[PDB]
Amino acid sequence: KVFGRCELAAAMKRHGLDNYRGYSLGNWVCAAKFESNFNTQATNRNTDGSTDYGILQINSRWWCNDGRTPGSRNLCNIPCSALLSSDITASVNCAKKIVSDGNGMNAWVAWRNRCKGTDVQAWIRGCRL
Ligand SMILES: [Cl-]
Ligand code: NA
């Protein structure tokens, strides 16, 4: 599923991401935009052979199992395929664990490079929440 901007903001808000660990809603939407272009089915392979999955491009190196990343962890305890669902619940619950692990949203390279220190509120302007 390819979310609309405000559709995703609303879904994210409903799943408890607004100001989660102090990150306003605009940050999560900005991150999703530049990680996946709002596509729940986005996958991308990394050089070390791990793969990033779904709307927030969660990495099989640490966070999920895809059966093909030898010596990796599965810290969210889910098949990576569950991160591709049109239901973003699994992605959100796993992201909550990632953002809590000490490094905040810096875990998402695109957020660090394209959202951090910008006016992220513009990403939810006009939306009915
Ligand atoms: Cl933080
Ligand atoms: Na893994």
DSSP one-letter string for 3-51: --HHHHHHHHHHTT-TTBTTB-HHHHHHHHHHHHTTBTT-EEE-TTS-E
- In angstroms, this model's resolution equals 2.1
Q: Show the domain range for 57.
A: 1-129
For residues 42 and 21, give the distance between their C-alpha atoms in angstroms, rounded to a whole number. 25
Q: What are phi and psi of 109, to 5 degrees?
A: -55, -40
97 alpha carbon to ligand 2 midpoint, in Å? 15
Identify the CATH number of the domain in which residue 98 sits. Answer: 1.10.530.10
101 known member of a binding site: yes
Q: How many domains does one find in the chain?
A: 1
Six-digit token string for 120: 């992220």
120 alpha carbon to ligand 2 midpoint, in Å? 31
Strand partners, 2: 39
**Method used to determine the 3D structure:** X-ray
